Ligand binder design. Sequence first.
Ligand SMILES: Nc1ncnc2c1ncn2[C@@H]1O[C@H](COP(=O)(O)OP(=O)(O)OP(=O)(O)O)[C@@H](O)[C@H]1O
Ligand SMILES: [Mg+2]
Ligand SMILES: [Mg+2]
Lengths: 258, 295
Amino acid sequence: VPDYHEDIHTYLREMEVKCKPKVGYMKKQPDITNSMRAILVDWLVEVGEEYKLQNETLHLAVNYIDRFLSSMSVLRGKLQLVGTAAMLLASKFEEIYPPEVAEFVYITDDTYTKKQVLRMEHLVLKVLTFDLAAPTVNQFLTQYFLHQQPANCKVESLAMFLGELSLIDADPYLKYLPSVIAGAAFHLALYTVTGQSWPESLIRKTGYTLESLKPCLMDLHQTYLKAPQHAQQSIREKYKNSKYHGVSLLNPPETLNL
Amino acid sequence: GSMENFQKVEKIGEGTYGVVYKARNKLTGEVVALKKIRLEGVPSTAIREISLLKELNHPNIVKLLDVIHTENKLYLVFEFLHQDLKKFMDASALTGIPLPLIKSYLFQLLQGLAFCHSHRVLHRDLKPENLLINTEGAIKLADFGLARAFGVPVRTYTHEVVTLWYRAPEILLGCKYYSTAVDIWSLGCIFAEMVTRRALFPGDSEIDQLFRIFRTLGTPDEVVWPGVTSMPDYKPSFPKWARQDFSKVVPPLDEDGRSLLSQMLHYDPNKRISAKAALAHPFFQDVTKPVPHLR
Ligand SMILES: Nc1ncnc2c1ncn2[C@@H]1O[C@H](COP(=O)(O)OP(=O)(O)OP(=O)(O)O)[C@@H](O)[C@H]1O
Ligand SMILES: [Mg+2]
Ligand SMILES: [Mg+2]
């Protein structure tokens, strides 16, 4: 379409391997669990809602957290601080008008001081060596959306919703690359709304087929089916809004016909 | 890498955070530029500048060697280049810069920019002050303080971008979406400036800037630029100037150079040439790498 669409996709595919957190880091974390991580990410979704942040900002913040926790043991009483600094960093990187630091101190219910947030920001930067331009599920989805025939707002919003749901559950989603999760989310959105499938123009673009997407797709399908019963509900609430065409109210398909 | 190994030589720039010093590595002998950033936490501009610079390794992009990251100070260590293009043009005031050098510089800039665009980075402040030249004939993009990582397709980014003289018409007219084409506009303005040795469109306000562009390229209509009259800051009252003969815009420029300039200054961002496509323009058939004729 432009120049650079192919060059950019290729580059993001290289960088997603380099920016990937360690699959099994939670096992090496003595004091925190997948469940506590789910509570943090869900809270971040709320924060994103309250300050009207981009979805990209959310995806970036979660990437920073998972990479940080891939090498830094953290106590449960400190997880939220890591999360708050990460959302602050994501905001400065991605937002036209990020919220002020005082506002990030505010949304932690005075759990931490301003100086703690600022010192944690510094530490996060050191640990990530200032490498903040990470590929996200979101960045892959917007590229895949250009292959719709024709464009469909419901498909786009639902795919975004499904991609967002994957952020909550480190098991199983930490083992999948963002481009793969995006593939599964887009097929599942397309199939739910229009009955269409992963298009072969995306097979040409990505090299992914429904066969290669199947492991992620089966997980995502189950996540979608089980969504209303999940302990964390901020994403479902968020995606009730007309902003996202209320796609969280659409009914998941019973089978994928594979 | 740490501050003991470096010996400050002289101040070579004033920034915003914000003092650039020439320094010598005492152990290796390497001459460097030290950009100091004073420490709302780490500024968003430094966060982006550092993260983006770390990804961009290209011979026509300034090299970020190291980041010295302490309690109250952030030091960015860059490769030292002798001069910026703005000062160079001033030193050649009378009697000009040779066409072969201009061609070489433009060819190199387009290389640097295409690399940026290929790695989803918009520069958003291309101007002669921010382009650095060495004694070997190299020129490099510098100052990524306004840069950002863009998405495909783009969404709405910061409006207040690109210093006025080099700012594209889609920004001036308030389009919700701008993209790589804005960096190409700036480069076209710089190309013209290297040839004529004066700024192409030196307005003192947004409206003044638009009118200067219109008097040179013609007032855009739906024919030349579909959608233009629906743009937020478009006014039907705009005076309607005729486009002028390009041989009069930059008289010393020959047919291939005029062709390339017109493609870089196309109104419609869709039709404006990419950095990648411009590398194959006939203007560059005879391109070499002359050394800068000065110091
Ligand atoms: N690596 C370098 N080698 C030589 N000179 C440099 C280098 N980096 C910066 N300078 C000089 O310092 C000036 C300011 O640095 P830079 O443009 O990177 O940051 P800035 O804060 O945006 O500066 P300004 O506010 O003057 O535009 C440059 O225009 C240049 O003349
Ligand atoms: Mg554990
Ligand atoms: Mg500058």
